[PDB]
Write a protein that binds this ligand. Structure first.
Ligand SMILES: CC(C)C[C@H](NC(=O)OCC1c2ccccc2-c2ccccc21)C(=O)O
Length: 425
């Protein structure tokens, strides 16, 4: 197809391999622990699952600066390559000990956390303003589809074969994809070796009216404004529940619901598939709402954020109420994750609604602060649930629901959407 849609497809596969390499461990740890198996304790498993988010936190904002400086192509390609090779060496790191695996996961976090800003730095030069929505949607849906596919796929490989083949498969697939990314993609349409003249003129002429402003991202602004911290804490509360689910759901099904590894992998993707299919309709629902009602822009934000952050909390509480039920617990979990889909138009769009031309930096700040739950939630949750502890699983579900409620309340108490009065260049 066209050059920019080729970039969109290759970005889709890139993010598919990013989230895969992120999530394959959450399924591999189900079989990698003893009742080749290792005698890892509950606290160790939490650290091993959470070590990735240390690197993801560390390399986020410097990754954005480097992407702005030297561009997206090489930076993202090398991030993916340095995640794939570390995944390939993870099985031998498991034999060397717990410490080697933790440092492997930390280095994977450092490699992988630069991917998102490197992609935004490419779409700052590739996506025309009229068409940015479709391109960003196609590019970023790769992450969600990556989780949705890599859960059952990891389960299938981990059941039919040993768990090491999961890591080998994803590592070799990452290397193979890098062999395409280094070749078909370029930093900027002027630097593209094969783009047609008319497409290049279209992209440049459409981006001219924005790049002619010459005032985008001139400094690190004074981010004292409370409306930024309200959306930051909303993102924190959302990511807390999302990552607590992502890093524990296969473990939860193995430990409480007692599903087989294959069935565990199949069922673990249902909540995220539901979340994807709800998020994709959420934009159309928001358009339908905007088409009729005289609501202010803040109104749709607050209603959608409340729905998408409260529904998951109440349904996670409900899943706590009838835990150990092989049929109803998974239904409540998938309903929770599906209701979580409204959060995009609830608060994720607010990042660029309250401050255009600063979205790439403000969203990076918010994502740096909101990946603290990736480091905190998994380890404390695994510490709180030592062996079976249906009561402690209820306890962690209550903790996640309370965090969601706090985030929704704080966001709705301080959400603004016009202008921060300093972002107006
Ligand atoms: C609102 C849409 C366009 C954004 C969405 N992006 C996405 O990557 O979701 C994955 C999940 C998430 C959901 C909502 C807000 C933040 C996050 C996030 C951050 C880090 C890792 C995973 C996630 C899309 O375009 O489909």
């Amino acid at each position: 197809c066209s050059a920019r849609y080729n970039l969109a497809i290759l970005a889709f596969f890139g993010f598919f391999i990013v989230y895969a390499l992120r999530v394959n461990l959450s399924v591999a740890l189900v079989d990698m622990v003893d009742s080749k198996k290792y005698q890892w304790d509950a606290e160790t498993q939490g650290w091993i699952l959470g070590s990735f988010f240390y690197g993801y936190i560390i390399t986020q904002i410097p990754g954005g600066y480097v992407a702005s400086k030297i561009g997206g192509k090489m930076l993202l390609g090398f991030g993916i390559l340095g995640t794939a090779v570390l995944t390939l060496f993870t099985p031998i790191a498991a034999d060397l000990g717990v410490g080697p695996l933790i440092v492997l996961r930390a280095l994977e976090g450092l490699g992988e956390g630069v991917t998102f800003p490197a992609m935004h730095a490419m779409w700052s030069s590739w996506a025309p303003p009229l068409e940015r929505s479709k391109l960003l949607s196609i590019s970023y849906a790769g992450a969600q589809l990556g989780t949705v596919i890599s859960l059952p796929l990891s389960g299938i490989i981990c059941y039919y074969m040993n768990w090491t083949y999961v890591f080998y498969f994803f590592g070799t697939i990452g290397i193979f994809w890098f062999l395409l990314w280094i070749w078909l993609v370029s930093d900027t349409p002027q630097k593209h070796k094969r783009i047609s003249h008319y497409e290049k003129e279209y992209i440049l002429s459409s981006l001219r009216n924005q790049l002619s402003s010459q005032k985008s991202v001139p400094w690190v602004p004074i981010l004292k404004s409370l409306p930024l911290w309200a959306i930051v804490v909303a993102h924190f509360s959302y990511n807390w529940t999302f990552y607590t689910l992502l890093t524990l759901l296969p473990t939860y099904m193995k430990e409480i619901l007692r599903f087989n590894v294959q069935e565990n992998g199949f069922l673990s993707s249902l909540p995220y598939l539901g979340s994807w299919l709800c998020m994709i309709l959420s934009g159309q629902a928001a358009d339908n709402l905007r088409a009729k009602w005289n609501f202010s822009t803040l109104c749709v934000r607050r209603i959608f954020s409340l729905i998408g952050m409260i529904g998951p909390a109440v349904f996670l509480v409900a899943a706590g109420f009838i835990g150990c039920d092989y049929s109803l617990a998974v239904a409540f979990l998938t309903i929770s994750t599906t209701l979580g889909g409204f959060c995009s138009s609830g608060f994720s769009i607010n990042h660029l609604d309250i401050a255009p031309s600063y979205a790439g930096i403000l969203l990076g700040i918010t994502n740096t602060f909101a990946t603290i739950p990736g480091m905190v939630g998994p380890v404390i949750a695994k510490s709180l649930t030592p062996d079976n502890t249906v009561g402690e699983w209820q306890t962690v579900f209550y903790i996640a629901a309370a965090i969601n409620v706090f985030g929704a309340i704080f966001f709705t108490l301080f959400a603004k959407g016009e202008v921060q009065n300093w972002a107006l260049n």
